[PDB]
Design a binder for this molecule. Structure first.
Ligand SMILES: Oc1cc(-c2ccccc2)nc2ccccc12
Length: 182
């Protein structure tokens, strides 16, 4: 920027993100409201986790699912925090959409907080090996790494997804909708 779309991302990292450590590694977490943090399901959190290096007891844990009952691959954790997150629910869209020129906000496994321009983002159907109960993720062409896991997909005034997967060429985010949190 620097740059309203970087300032936005940087402030989001600063005030709402954390590094969640589990037996599976380090993931970026996003505090949404109250003491709820969203983290990739693959982090596979125990009864206790580490938040920015500090052992925290997870009270409740909720796997998120779409309209057709397919797991999003993000889970919501109720933490033992101080403390309360500034409610960012208003930046989360209500419905699916495609989004031109998005960024990715990364904290975990990075030297310092990082903003990556991932380019244009399109919804893409999950590929199913059984049935036709569809699910979408937000896809982008960018060689993402497994260390980006948990990263926040955003644009100014919009918190759009959580980075959860990739194949070397494309990255994929779990599509965030406000109704998952209200
Ligand atoms: O963005 C990602 C990319 C890859 C990945 C997979 C195969 C080759 C190169 C990179 N693997 C990932 C694993 C977990 C979370 C995110 C990931």
């Amino acid at each position: 920027g620097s740059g309203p779309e970087e300032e936005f991302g940087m402030s989001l990292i600063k005030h709402n993100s954390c590094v969640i450590t589990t037996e599976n590694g380090k993931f970026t977490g996003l505090g949404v409201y109250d003491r709820f943090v969203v983290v990739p399901t693959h982090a596979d959190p125990g009864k206790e986790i580490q938040v920015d290096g500090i052992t925290t007891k997870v009270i409740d844990s909720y796997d998120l699912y779409n309209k057709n009952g397919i797991k999003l691959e993000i889970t919501v954790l109720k933490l033992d925090r101080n403390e309360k997150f500034r409610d960012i629910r208003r930046y989360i869209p209500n419905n699916e959409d495609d989004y031109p020129n998005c960024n990715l906000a990364l904290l975990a496994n990075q030297p310092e907080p990082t903003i990556i321009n991932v380019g244009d983002v399109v919804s893409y159907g999950n590929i199913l090996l059984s049935g036709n109960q569809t699910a979408r993720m937000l896809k982008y062409s960018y060689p993402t790494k497994s260390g980006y896991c948990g990263g926040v997909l955003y644009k100014i005034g919009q918190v759009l997804g959580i980075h959860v997967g990739g194949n070397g060429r494309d990255g994929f985010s779990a599509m965030l909708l406000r109704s998952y949190f209200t």
